[PDB]
Every structure is written in structure tokens, then in C-alpha cells.
Design a protein around this motif. Sequence first.
Motif, PDB file in Angstrom:
ATOM      1  N   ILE A 310      -6.934 -81.947  10.545  1.00 53.75           N
ATOM      2  CA  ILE A 310      -6.142 -81.108   9.794  1.00 53.75           C
ATOM      3  C   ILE A 310      -5.136 -81.688   8.655  1.00 53.75           C
ATOM      4  O   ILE A 310      -4.174 -82.229   9.031  1.00 53.75           O
ATOM      5  N   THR A 332      -6.553 -75.178   5.374  1.00 52.13           N
ATOM      6  CA  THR A 332      -5.780 -76.014   6.220  1.00 52.13           C
ATOM      7  C   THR A 332      -4.825 -75.099   7.068  1.00 52.13           C
ATOM      8  O   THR A 332      -4.882 -75.630   8.669  1.00 52.13           O
ATOM      9  N   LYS A 333      -4.212 -74.029   6.458  1.00 57.98           N
ATOM     10  CA  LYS A 333      -3.470 -73.161   7.323  1.00 57.98           C
ATOM     11  C   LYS A 333      -4.130 -72.442   8.244  1.00 57.98           C
ATOM     12  O   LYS A 333      -3.453 -72.108   9.202  1.00 57.98           O
ATOM     13  N   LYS A 336      -5.187 -74.306  11.381  1.00 53.36           N
ATOM     14  CA  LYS A 336      -3.877 -74.718  12.098  1.00 53.36           C
ATOM     15  C   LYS A 336      -3.378 -73.694  13.079  1.00 53.36           C
ATOM     16  O   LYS A 336      -2.642 -73.958  14.062  1.00 53.36           O
TER      17      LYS A 336
END
Lengths: 475, 266, 89, 132
Positions: A310, A332-333, A336
Motif C-alpha cells: 500500500i 491506494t485508498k 486500504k
Amino acid sequence: LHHSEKKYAEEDQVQELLKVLNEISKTTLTLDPRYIWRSLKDLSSLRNQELLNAETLCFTVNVLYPDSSSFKKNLLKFITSNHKSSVPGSAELRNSYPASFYSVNTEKKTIEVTAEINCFMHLLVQLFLWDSKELEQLVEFNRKVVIPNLLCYYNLRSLNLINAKLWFYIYLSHETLARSSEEINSDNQNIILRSTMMKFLKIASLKHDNETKAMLINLILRDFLNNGEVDSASDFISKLEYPHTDVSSSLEARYFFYLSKINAIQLDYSTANEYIIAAIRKAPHNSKSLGFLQQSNKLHCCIQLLMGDIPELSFFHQSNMQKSLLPYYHLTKAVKLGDLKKFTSTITKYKQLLLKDDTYQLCVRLRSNVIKTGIRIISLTYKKISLRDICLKLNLDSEQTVEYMVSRAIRDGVIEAKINHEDGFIETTELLNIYDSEDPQQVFDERIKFANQLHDEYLVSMRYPEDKKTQQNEK
Amino acid sequence: LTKSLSIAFENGDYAACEKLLPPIKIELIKNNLLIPDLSIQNDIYLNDLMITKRILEVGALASIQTFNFDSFENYFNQLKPYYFSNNHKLSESDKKSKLISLYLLNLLSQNNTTKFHSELQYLDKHIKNLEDDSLLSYPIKLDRWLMEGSYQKAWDLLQSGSQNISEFDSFTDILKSAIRDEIAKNTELSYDFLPLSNIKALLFFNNEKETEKFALERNWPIVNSKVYFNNQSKEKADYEDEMMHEEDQKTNIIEKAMDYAISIEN
Amino acid sequence: MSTDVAAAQAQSKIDLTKKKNEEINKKSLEEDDEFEDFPIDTWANGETIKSNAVTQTNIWEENWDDVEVDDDFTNELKAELDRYKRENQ
Amino acid sequence: TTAAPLLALLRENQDSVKTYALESINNVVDQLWSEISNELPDIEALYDDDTFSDREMAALIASKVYYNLGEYESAVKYALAAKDRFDIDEKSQFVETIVSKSIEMYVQEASKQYTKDEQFYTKDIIDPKLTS
């Protein structure tokens, strides 16, 4: 008037050409001619773009050419002919020289040192095309003439390093021409191009000229990446031994970048990660190199999400690239949180942009990775966690289903847990105390060898120019 | 020759096609030669090009169903150049879309996804949005459900891939077999104890004797209806050591210090 | 325009005549500058770059926010709601 | 292109198309060298078989691939297995590559064996094809 500008530019070329010409006559040299040549490379671009277009024509006519003048003139007649400054004193003289290719000497034919001058003529015309920013036929003409000219003689060591830069521009115009538009004529010409690339490389192998080979290796890898014949590329990367010697820091940057793409498709996410961080550190920071750096940074972010590593949130904000990397920031979010719902929306929403960069292929693979990453969070947050609770968080359907997902994910060993079926929970085995194991030994062993190899690289580089100062006269 | 094969294929025999194909390979030397290998295409070579694709196309289709995966691929590779170039003139074909769907399935049943993605990249530039995805969708969806390891979704998709009775049902059986092995590796890590009922569900068996049948062949020691996967981990770990590399695989305390020393004294 | 902290990569290489044209060649190879094409493509100035305070412009040190939820609303409800369950027990 | 078609022909068991296959392979063996190297023991199996006239051709393919691989000693072994088709590479502007390494290989053998005896022309250390 017009001739005055051409003459100022002409003299520029000649001094850089004359200097090198002396150097290679004593014995063929590689890096010392290269330094001069690399500065001349920049110069030719800034004069040609800003200042006339028959400025190339004047030099080419003035020197004794083998056919190159004829090849230049066709291009210019089509866009409105110029025949000015092909008159005596611009087609009679071969440009003042001491004896190296001097006007009297050459006309008399005691000498015909047309050799380097011919290579430089090829570089001028190829550059001038790319500077103009015209594709289709102009490209095809450039390709046909220059390729067989150089191969009807075995290039000497010195001439050979020049022709690697010629091979680059031909290939680049051809590639972008195919990416302009789908055409039934563009398609058939790519097979033609493919053949020449590998043949050039075989010549470069024979002379063991290091920078020629390395530059040629890049072009083959690029073309594989665009055609989707990674299968054919896996073999090719296995038979490399890439020189790190006479290269430019631009060559080295491109090389490590190409391994990372192939690696990602072979589910090498581990070696891919080092290789892309490596590529950026050779690569300059500049707005001149920006489109290179962008593609490198997109490649890097995706590699990390495929690990489950990540990327930092920091990476996106502090860069001056936030708009380009905007989809990667949202990916990326998405991973996550563990959100299927966000993720499906993000890659559809940004589909086309992703599709231009040829990283749309990588993104779909992250659909698995949302699930795996979701489970690694869950094992940290809860030691013992019921099967049902997990289903709530990730929007799953059954207890039995999530058991398959974790079973597979710990075969990769990312979650570091073990599943109790009989009790309904998943229990992590993480407790460290790995400073009681022999693990630190291995890790320390690796660091030391890296340090030692850095000494070796200090040794080869440091003393090599020291020797040269004793050799040269400055007493 | 060419037509004799043609009519063997339509009847419904593929054992007929296969026997008669080594005669047709001889004449396929000629069909490759009459075209100059796509260095120039005209409307003369468009007629020629149709013969060369058509002969390989039906020979390839026949191979799947007589369970000669080797022969199926041998023909597919020959197709590749006509698909590769000259697009917008008989290089895009109805048969091409159908044939890529099956080819992709053949590769996935090899259990290398490494090859799959590499082929997949090539299909992006070609038809994947131009003749869209509706059966070219199927091999990708399946790959996704195994990489994440949701095997309910995977088993479902293959189950619905048995309502694809033509020649697609022939890769489905291999892929139901492969899955049993996959989950059986997984359960080494996950468990050390399962009852028989819990084993039966996970390996996707409906019969108790089938579970015990696999357990003997996979070398699970199920004694008293309970497995001991930790025995099974030992074997697989032990196999990784046995292969001679073995000095530096273990990595000797003594050897590290020696290494450090010599580098300084180089 | 540099990736992360700019001065750390500005010192790594400065202006040289040898590499300058070579910098262009790599950029041209990838095909575009890729920071000026995305605005044309989207056909309006984004609001997903204004998705957080830092995403548009960061003159701060990264919070680690990217979800930005007021946590005072949910905590206020947590305190009172627990209190009621106890009172009505 | 791909070396993938070329493999198919080797896996096919009809004699006509294997004889054909070696000829297709040597034509573009300066484009697909790395690719065909992986499935090259197939070509050694054809070379052994004497159902071919293209034992010479099968052998000659190996030579070119080994040079591009990086192993020059073996490229020359297969140069001498192939028999002929090596006097046309003494006037080409492309492949003189395989030939030159043979010359180097002679010098290796001669040094070892001159010290033993002056005559090494009657010796079988020196291959007659290597001498020629």
C-alpha cells in the motif's frame, strides 16, 4: 541575409565535428568522443527548431555526400522548395579544415574522409523530422535510406556508437505512427521494423560495444510491451547480461524501468519494487524528463498495491503530479479500506486513462488484492474474530465463503493466521520474539554484502581518472 | 484434400478429421507459401489468405474435442500472424472471437497465469472492446476468482460453464479437478484438525467415499475421521531441503563470519 | 515539477548539456508529458483533487487523513447512548 | 513475430512439415533466437534421426542460437556438425559471426599439442573440418 544565419549555424557543427575527427584518428575512442557528441546532440535541436529548415540543407550540400543531399532535398521541395545557397561558395567548398577533410585535399581525392560526416548528416535529418513533429511518409523515407547505407560497410567502433541514436528515432516515429490511428498499412510495416531491431543487436554483440547494445535492448523491450508478446519477452530478459559501463545515465534509467513491467506480468512484485525505485534514482528530476517519470511513478504505485504493501498517502500530495496520479491515489485508498464497492467504481470511472497507460491490465488484478488486504487488517484489529463479523465488514455472503478466501490468502502467507473451522473464529499466530531466532543473522548478513559491493564501486571509479592526470601534460 | 477434411468436420466426427489431417499438413506447406507471409496484401492475397486461415481454423476446432490439447495449440499459433496485422481486411472474423475464447481456456488449464496475462495484453489492442466481451469475459472472470481464492464463485462459474455444451465443456472438467488440489494445499496452513464433514464440503465432494479416496492419494493421514495436516507440512518442508543446494540453504554461522572477513582482506 | 520533496532530487542531478536532450528523448518515448493531457481528457477542472485539503495543495506535513470524518459527532452519541442503556436497565 | 508457429511444426509428427520447419526456423533465426532456444532439444532429436536430409540444416540452426546466447564454443561444435553453409558467410555483410570464433578455437588446440609433438596434423585432436 538568410545565408548569414545558415553560415553561423554551419560553423557550430563543424568545430564539434572537427574535434572528434582528430580524436578517432589517433585510435578509436568511446567515452571521449561521446562527451562531445552528447553536447552536439542538444545543439542540433535548438538551432533547427528555432532557425530555418534549409539550414540543414546548406551543410549537407557543402560537404561531399554519397547520396544524402538528394535525400534531404526531396523532403524540402514538397513543403515549398529552397534552392538558394546551393551556389558556389556553398556547393564548391567542403568547409575549411587543416587536412582532415579540407576543401582542396578532398576535391583532389587524396582523401575522402566522408565517414563521420555521413553519420552526422543522418542525425541532422532524423532530428529535424522529430523537431517538426510530422509522422507518416516522411518517416518512411528516413527509414529506407539510412538503414542499408550503414550496413553495406562494417562500421568501425567509433562510427557504431552514433548509429544507435539513429535506430532510436526511426523506431519512435514508426511506433507513434502506429499509435496515431489503426491502419491496414501501419500494421504490415511493424513486421518490417521488428526484423531490423534484432539484426542491429547482433551487430552490436560482435563488436562488444556496450552502449550500442544497451540502447538496442531497450527498443526491443518497448516493442514487446506494446504488442503484448510478454511470453516472447520473458525469454529475452533471461538471456541478458546488461552492461553498466559506457552507458548514459538515461540508458540505465530506461532499462530498469522495462524489467519492472515484465516482472509485474510474471507476478514478480518483489524484484519489480527495487527495480522501479532504482530507475527513478538514475533518472533526472526535470520537466524535460517528466513523461518518463510519470509512467515510472504510476508503475511503482500499482506494484505496491499488488504486493499488498500500500503506497504512502504522502507520495501523491508532495509530488507535483497529483492530477496524473489521481487514479492511483484513489486506488491506494480503495484497497486500504478493503472496499470492493469503491474499487469497482474507481477503475470503471478512470478506465480509459488507465487504458492509455497500458496499466489498465494491472488494475483489474487488484480485485483479488482488495480481498487479501481486507483480511490482513482484520487479523491485526481482532485476535479472534467470528466468521460472520467479517462478512459484515467486507459485504460477504456466507461463513463458508470467507473461509475459502483466507485459506488461499495464507497459502501466500500474508495474513499470518490459522482458521478454526470447529470454533468459528480465526486466530493469528503473530507474537514475534524473533530476536530469539536466527533471523536477524540473515538480515545483517545481506546488509554487509551490500556495503562491501559499494566499496568495490568506490574502487573502480575513484582511481581510474587519477591515472589519466599522470598521463596528460600539465607540468 | 482440403474439402475432404471439410466434410469430415461438419458430420460431427473429429476422429475422422484427425486421421485425415497429416495428409492436409503436406498441402498446408503450399498454403503458407502461396501468401508471401503478409509482406504485401492485395485482394489477390485476400483470396489466398482465406484458404490459409480456413484450413487451420477447422483443424484447430476439431482438436479440443478429441482431447489433443497439443494439436489444438499447434494450429492456434499458426493463426497468430493473420490476426496480428492487416486489421480491417479479413483479419477480424466471427470465428476469431470464438477461437480466442477457447484458446484462453486451454492456457488457464495449464495452471500458469503467467502466460494468461501475457496473451491477455495482446487482446486489448485487438478485439476486446471492438467485438466486446460476452464470452471473452469468461476466462478472465474465472482467473480472478482463483487469485483471490473465492472458490464458491469459481465452482459456480464452471458449473454454469457446463451449460456451454459445444467444446467449452472440455476444459471445464480439467478445471474442476485442479481446484480440488488447490484447496488441499491451502488447508495445510489453515487447519490441523477437520472432521470428515468439514473435509467433504471444502474439497467440493458430495460423496463420503470420494473424500476418503482423495485423502489416500493426496497422502492425508485421516485416522479416526480426523486429519493431521502438521504431518503434511513436514513432508513439504522436508522436500524443500532435500534438494542439494544444501550448505548455503541452511546457512552456517561459521560461514557468515568467514565471508565478512575475506571481503575486508580482499 | 518533481516527485516527492523536490530539492532532494534537484541536487541529485543539475543542468548538463550532455543529458539535456536525452531527458526529452525519454519523455517523448513514453509519449506525452502526462500532466496536461488529463485536464483535456476529463473536460473540466477536477473536484476529486479537492477531495481533501491536502490533495489540492499541501503546504502542511501529511496528517494521514484521507477519509476526513468528524469524530466528535459519533463520540457524543456514544457517550449518551451508553448512558441511556444503563439508566433503562 | 513469434517463434510459436515454429514450435507447432516440431510437435507435429508428419514428416513433410518437420522437414519444412527447419527451413522456416533458419530464415528468421536472427529475430527469434532467444525464443527458439527453450524448445531446442526438439531439434537435436530431429538431427539424430536420419529420416531427414536437413540434419545439416537442423545443426546449423543451433550454431546461430548459441552465439546469440553467448556460448561461442558450442556454436562452433554445431558449425562443424552442420557441414558446409559456412563459405557463404565469408563474403556477407551480416553473419561472419559464427565463422570467426572457429578461427580462434584452432589457436587454442594448436598450442596444447605443438609442445607434445610437431606433427599434430596426423593428430585427431584437430578436427579436419576445423582445419579446413
